[PDB]
Each structure stands twice: as C-alpha cells, then as structure tokens.
Amino acid sequence: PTPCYISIEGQTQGLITAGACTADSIGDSFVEGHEDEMLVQQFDHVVTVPTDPQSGQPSGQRVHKPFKFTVALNKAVPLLYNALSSGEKLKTVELKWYRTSIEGKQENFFTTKLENASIVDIHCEMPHCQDPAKSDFTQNVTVSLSYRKITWDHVNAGTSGSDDWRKPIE
C-alpha cells in the first residue's frame, strides 16, 4: 500500500506539520512538495452505531472510535504532545490517500478531512534493537484523533460523505 499524508492545523500552534518532511525532521526520507505534511504509514478507524438486538433499527446515534495513524518521530511529534496533554483542538486534519494511477503518477483518490479534533492518545514505541525481524522499522508514533466533524471525499469519482455533531441531519 502507498503511504498517505496528513496536514494538521492546531488552534493555537498554527500549522503543526509545517516542516514535518524537511531534512531536519526525518533525515533523507523527506519528499519535496510535501513539506507541510507528515508521512503516514499505518491507518485504522472505526465508526460504530449501537443497534438493538432482535431488530435491525439503530438504537442510538453513531459513536466515533478514533483515528489511528502512524508516523515516525519528527518535528511535529513534540507539537502533538501539547495538543494531547492540554486538550487543544485541531482545526483540520486532511488525510490524503495516494495510489498509483494508470499513467504512472501518484494521485489522491480519497481524502478524509476533519474538523475540530482533539488527540485522544499517542502511542510512541520503538521495536527491539536486538531483533533482526524488525530492523527496517525506525519508530512508531500512533496518534489518535477523536473529532467533531469528518468528511470523507472520493476525488476521482466525486462522491462525498459527511458526519457532524454540530449539524446532524435535521
């Protein structure tokens, strides 16, 4: 799978990922043109709806389980440990799913934007240095995001979903 890109903008800390793919953040694995966007490796996201038994109807509104995106240690990680430990909301988070098209060029076929989105938890780990099976990995900083409003958006087919606590559907 191809890695995605996330651009986080905080309430008070401005654009958090501004510079999270320079040569100072991640060494020689930075990408030109994506200077304001982290490099997201793994992803996971659940949106449940409590339904009653012995029926099919939704017995309650949706419950957003958090984002789980994984980036390496870089410039934006000390900035994301103040959005976490102080409960600062983040004005936007624009994940962009890339894929390799037919003509041979990367393109975002799917973007999941995000409105006011605090960070629930951040799971910084490093695999065992003695272990040769996990030698290619560097670090794993899995930043979670609960969120008010999320907008899925498929670009190459124009569809767009949306959920919002602020404006539920009438």
Binding site: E103, K105, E107, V155, N156, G158, T159, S160, S162
Partner: protein, 405 residues
C-alpha cells in the same frame, strides 16, 4: 412623469436596484454600456458579419476573448421588444452573439408584443397559445426554431421602482410633497425586469458561485423587497401590484411553454417569484426511435437556461484555464488528466447529496474524451459531456378516500 424623464429615470434608478442587491464583495462586477436600441441594430447592419460588429467587441473581445480579462456572464437588455422586423433582426443578431461569447441575452417584451397596447389587460387573454400562431409572428416562430436562440431569454411584465412620495411616509427635506398619481398607471416609475431577473443570476452566484438557482420562490428565484403603494380603492384599502398584472399559474405555464420568463407576484405583499427560466428555443420533436425519444429529452435540457449557465461557466473557466497552458510541455494523456482532475471538484456523482453539495457542485457526471487531429499533429478534439441535477416541477396528487386504511 415626462416621457424623456421617466424613461431615463427607470433606466437609471433600475440600475441602482441592480447595484444595491448584488454583493460586489462576493466576486461580482457589472459593465455599463451606453447604446440606444435604434443604434444597436444599425451597428449590426454596420459590420458584414456578427464576428466583426461593435457590440461583439464589448461582449466577446474586450471581455471573454482577452488574455486575463474577466469574461461576460450575461447581457442585460434594457429594451422593450416588438415582434416587428427591426426587433427580430436584432435578436437574430443577438442569438448569434450569445452563441459566440457563451452569454445569454436577457431583455423583455413589451405590451405591444402580445398585441394589447395597454398592459393591465393581460389576464383577460383567454387563449395565448393561438395568439403566437398568428402570421404577424413568422419572424418569431422562426427565431424560436433556430439553434442560436438558446442564448436568448425574454423576461417578465415590468416591476415597480419608486414609491410615490408622501409628507408622512416618505417625506422630502423642508417640503411636503404628495405625488398625485392619477388613474393612468404609466406614471409609476416602472422599471425593466431584465434588471430584476439578473438580480437572481447574481444573488445565486454570490451564495454558491454558480447559477442554476433562479427558478425558486424559496430556492433563489424570489424577487423580494418590491415597492408597494397602499392607496384607497372604491371603498376598500388595497395595494398597487408591484408587477403590472397578476400572472396566474395557468398563464405562467402557458408563457413557460412559449418561451418566456414570467414573474408571478405574491398577491398581497412585496414579493414575487420566477418559476421557469426557459429560453425562447423550442424543444424539437424527434421521431419515435430509441435514440429519437432519448435525444428529444437531451435537446430539451438545452433550452431551459439554468443549465446553460452551468456550462457557460464551463466555457468561461475552461477558456481561461487552457489559455495559460499554451507553450507548456504536455501530452494527450496529460491533457486528459488536467481536465478530469479539474472538473471532478464540480461533480458530485451521488443520488442524494445534501443541499449544499448540490449547488456547490452543480454537475452530476462528466465525460472527457480527448482525441487527436491528424495531418497537423497536436490539436485536440476533446468532448466534455457534463450532466446536471434535476429540480422540482409539477406533480399530480390524485386524492381519494380508502375508508379503512
């Protein structure tokens, strides 16, 4: 109340009604051209071809046909059209101008267009379909069948501009002025509704940055805040109607089939509404094949004119966007991609999106097929094939009682 003053007051205070309503902060500009209506047909008689006229210079070349210049959305005609030959020759030369610069020419017909010579006897017309099938209108029914008539809408009756003054309601400074309006309703400052219909072209653009939203009494075709004049009738206290006739629903539907943008007035208040912005083009009856029954519904979508305005913008954006690119290093595969990734921010291919996704993204599906030109290689016949969403017009509501269910 003079014919030189009032005709030059309605043509100028009616502009102020077009300046005050349209939000110029939300990316709107309006050009003002001094012609006279008799000069303009002479100016089309001036050039041997419409592509060398003097109005073609100001509509096409000074605007749309210009590197970096802002292109022309629509032409407000501040005119009073007759069905005579010096006014069907003008519209033949305005439909061809509107098909070159991709901008429909909106103006109005007069009282004498319907053959009544005094306007408030319009609901007395008991059959308006047979009036248009008269031999006086041979230069009208041949205009309607023409292909370039798609860019010609002709608007409403008229509408009121100025409340007559009063020493209590609307006073004047250091004077008491009671404007004695007689039984002649020509003394009211009656404006031209090409002002008021272009108010809805622009107040739809200032909200959604497109314009299909012009035909709704609650959806963007409601000319609000009209002037009213409460006067004493024969015993009762009534209001002067801000449009000169009360257009019924059957009269407006008969004007909708015959190519008119009528303005029904909300009887008893200061509001009005458009219901159908159909251009003067006629839906051509195609034979009863599989493709003929299909292409009849395809050709019907061309004439209706909110749908032209979502592809006139797809002639003004794409002319500008592919003007910067001349001289680049591109390919046919790169030409397919710079257009498909561009228009799919205007496409919401979705059966029921929310009410904001429908109007920010007015298209529904778009096909782009870039081909080549052999002989001189590097010339690209692409075929952008957009498709719109569909609004709400007519139902049946066939009531009954069941008794048990």
């Amino acid at each position: 109340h003079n014919s030189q003053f009032q005709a030059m007051e309605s043509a100028w205070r009616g502009l102020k009604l077009f300046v005050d309503r349209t939000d110029f902060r939300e990316n709107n500009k309006v050009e003002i051209l001094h012609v006279t209506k008799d000069e303009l047909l002479e100016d089309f008689e001036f050039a041997p071809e419409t592509a060398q006229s003097g109005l073609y210079k100001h509509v096409y070349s000074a605007g749309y046909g210009q590197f970096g210049g802002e292109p022309v959305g629509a032409i407000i005609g501040n005119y009073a059209f007759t069905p005579s030959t010096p006014d069907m020759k003008l519209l033949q030369y305005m439909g061809a101008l509107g098909a070159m610069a991709h901008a429909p020419f909106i103006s109005s017909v007069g009282p004498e267009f319907f053959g009544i010579d005094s306007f408030e006897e319009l609901p007395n017309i008991k059959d308006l379909k047979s009036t248009f099938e008269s031999p006086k209108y041979t230069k009208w029914r041949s205009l309607r069948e023409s292909e370039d008539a798609r860019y010609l809408g002709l608007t409403a009756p008229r509408f009121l501009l100025r409340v007559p003054y009063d020493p209590i309601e609307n006073p004047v400074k250091s004077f008491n002025y009671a404007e004695n309006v007689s039984a002649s309703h020509e003394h009211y400052l009656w404006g031209n509704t090409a002002f008021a219909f272009a108010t809805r072209l622009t107040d739809s653009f200032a909200k959604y940055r497109w314009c299909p939203n012009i035909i709704g009494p609650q959806s963007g075709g409601a000319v609000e805040d009209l002037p009213v004049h409460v006067f004493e009738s024969m015993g009762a206290l009534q209001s002067k109607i801000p449009t000169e006739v009360l257009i019924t629903d059957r009269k407006e539907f008969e004007l909708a089939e015959e190519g008119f943008i009528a303005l029904t007035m909300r009887k008893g208040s200061d509001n009005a509404a458009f219901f159908s912005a159909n251009s003067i083009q006629k839906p051509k009856v195609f034979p009863n094949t599989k493709e003929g029954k299909e292409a009849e519904t395809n050709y019907k979508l061309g004439t209706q004119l909110p749908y032209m305005m979502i592809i006139n913008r797809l002639a003004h954006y794409v002319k500008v966007l592919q003007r910067e690119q001349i001289g680049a290093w591109k390919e046919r595969q790169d030409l397919e991609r710079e257009l498909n990734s561009w228009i799919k921010q205007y496409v919401a291919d979705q059966e029921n999106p929310p009410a904001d996704v429908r109007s920010r993204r007015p298209l529904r599906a778009a096909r782009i097929e870039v081909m080549d030109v052999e002989g001189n290689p590097g010339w690209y016949q692409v075929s952008l094939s957009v498709r719109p969403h569909f609004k709400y017009m007519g139902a049946n509501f066939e009531l009954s009682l069941v008794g048990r269910l």
